[PDB]
Structure 1
Amino acid sequence: VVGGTEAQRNSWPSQISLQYRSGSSWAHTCGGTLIRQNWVMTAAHCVDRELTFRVVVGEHNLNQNDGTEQYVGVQKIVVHPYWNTDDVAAGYDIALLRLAQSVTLNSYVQLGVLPRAGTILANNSPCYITGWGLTRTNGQLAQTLQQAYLPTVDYAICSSSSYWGSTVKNSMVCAGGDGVRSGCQGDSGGPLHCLVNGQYAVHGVTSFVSRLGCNVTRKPTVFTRVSAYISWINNVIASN
């Protein structure tokens, strides 16, 4: 997250860290949202590689013992069937991970609330992106979970020529674009939390930023629209 602030430890309890095994250690690669005690929602592009993945819930500082972490293997990966790694702009950047064990809920570990199906946020709706992604374009991952206020940019504006054009689809949510704050590599898969009717819900799954850089004016961070996939998610969880 570029231009973020450190999140309080119990602010975003559904945020998880999706990590892969590298040597005798684990590396954070993406965020995700805990949606069931044994299911995580993340981006399909995060699980394109044939890696060994684990999920960390109750994580705050990737480099320090927080005393709240729960580490669980990923037992099954269900990527949206229309996902195409060669075309992130087509959308469908979403995947569900069945965890090997059910995690324990507490103030640091909670299920993310998802929007009702079809919900679209009004332009400029208040949201926060959270994650341990790069804190600068071509930078380094954060140690501590970051949050950045990223108001939505509606489809009409987001898909206009000076923004993302045809690259953005109505199955996505754009947010930010102020040139200061944004998602960045390593935030992928994580949530876009937006305040609606007093409650934060996870309206987006971080999907992509410009190839030019993370915080690029008029290139808001683009997220998979969670509300476009409610039926899909339910169908996956019910059959697995």
Structure 2
Amino acid sequence: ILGGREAEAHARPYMASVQLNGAHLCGGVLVAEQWVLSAAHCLEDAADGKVQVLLGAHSLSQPEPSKRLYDVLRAVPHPDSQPDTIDHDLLLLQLSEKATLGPAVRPLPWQRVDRDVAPGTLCDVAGWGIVNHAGRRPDSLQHVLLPVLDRATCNRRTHHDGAITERLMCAESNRRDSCKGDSGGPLVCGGVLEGVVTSGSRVCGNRKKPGIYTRVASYAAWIDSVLA
């Protein structure tokens, strides 16, 4: 997260750190007791590593009573996702068992009605991604409030040039933005999950290249299908 602040410890109980060989790789969000939603390009960069999900965490390295590292029974990338596109960039991770719920660990309600979040709406994105251009990785969860950006502006040639489909949404990126390591994490609006930080490489904090998030509402049937 760029231009954000350290988050209040365990105030976002749905926040997950998807890890590869003990190292934070991507953000994720607990959407059911045994399922965490993240981005597909994340586990692309795996296949040759152990994928786990850390829940109830604030600090990645320090002990915390609510922290628990879960193994993953099955990784389910969206069937239509492709290495060179930013479409259908979702991945569902089935934990080895239902997560122990508590004040620090709880699934977040997610949007099932397919209607766009109104432009200007302030949404929250959190993550353990880089915090500056040098690539500094924070030990604890950071977050930033970002206003949703209308799709037409986001699609202008000067911005994302038509790449934003109805299944994608944008948030402003003027100095405040999600960045490398935050991909797969949640964009929460009004206490409901609306988007998943896309995981295509992108410049951070440049208002001319808005943040791109996959709209969960657009994939409600697929998520339901996988958790069936």
Structure 2 length-normalised TM: 0.95
Change in CA separation of 1:210 and 1:43 when aligned onto 2, cut-off 3 Å: closer
Partner Cα distance (2:100, 2:7) in 1:
21
| Contact 1:183/1:209 (<8 A) preserved | no
2:19 aligned residue: 19
Structure 2 equivalent of residue 124 of structure 1: 120
- 1:185 alignment partner AA: K
Q: Distance in 2 between matches of 1:182 and 1:144?
A: 17
Distance 1:154 1:177, change over 3 A: same
Alpha-carbon distance between aligned partners in 2 of 1:175 and 1:193, rounded to the nearest angstrom: 11
Partner of 1:32 in structure 2?
28
Alpha-carbon displacement from aligned partner over 1:42-93 (angstroms, at most 9, x marks no partner): 00111112021000100101121122101110110111000001212xx100
Structure 1: which 4+ aligned runs deviate by more than 2 Å?
A: 208-211
Instruction: Name the aligned partner's letter for residue 226 of structure 1.
Output: V
Confirm whether residue 101 of structure 1 aligns to residue 97 of structure 2.
yes
Q: CA deviation at 1:209?
A: 6.5
Partner residue of 1:205?
196
| In 2: Cα distance, 1:210 partner to 1:71 partner | 27
Structure 2 counterpart of 1:5, one-letter code: R
* Alignment check: 8 A CA contact 2:124 2:146 kept: yes
Q: Residue 41 of structure 2 is aligned with which of 30, 33, 45?
A: 45
What's the CA shift for 1:140?
2.0
- 1:67 counterpart SS class: coil
User: The residue matched to 1:215 in structure 2 has which SS?
Assistant: coil
Superimposed CA distance per residue, residues 117-137 of structure 1 (whole angstroms, 9 cap, x where no aligned partner): 312111111101100000113
Residues 40 and 199, structure 2, Cα contact 8 Å, conserved in 1:
no
Letter in 1 for 2:74: K
What secondary structure is seen at the aligned counterpart in 2 of 1:229?
helix
Task: Tell me, in whole angstroms, the C-alpha distance in 1 between the residues paired with 2:12 and 2:156.
Answer: 32
- The reply to whether residue 181 of structure 1 matches residue 171 of structure 2 is no
Q: Following the alignment from structure 1 to structure 2, what is the Cα–Cα distance between the partners of residues 138 and 101? A: 38
Q: Tell me if structure 2 keeps the 8 A contact 1:72–1:100.
A: yes
Query: Quick check: 1:222 aligned with 2:217?
Result: no
* Contact kept? 1:184, 1:209, Cα under 8 Å: no
SS at match of 2:169: strand
Question: What number of residue pairs does the alignment pair up?
Answer: 226
Q: What does 1:35-114 align with in structure 2 at a 5 Å threshold?
A: 35-48=31-44, 49-50=46-47, 51-88=49-86, 91-114=87-110
> CA–CA distance in 2 between the matches of 1:188 and 1:128?
14
Partner of 2:162, secondary structure, is helix
Q: 1:219 to 1:208 in 2, by over 3 A?
A: farther
Alpha-carbon deviations, 1:84-103, whole Å to 9, x = none? 01212xx1000111111111
Aligned CA distance change for structure 1 residues 181 and 154 (closer, same or farther; 3 Å): same
Whichever residue aligns with residue 168 of structure 2, its letter is M
Distance 2:113 2:103 in 1: 27
Q: Secondary structure at the match of 1:235?
A: helix
Q: Which amino acid aligns with 2:177?
A: S
Aligned residues: percent identity?
34
Counterparts in 2 of 1:137-152, with a 5 A limit?
Answer: 137-152=133-148
Q: CA deviation at 1:210?
A: 6.0
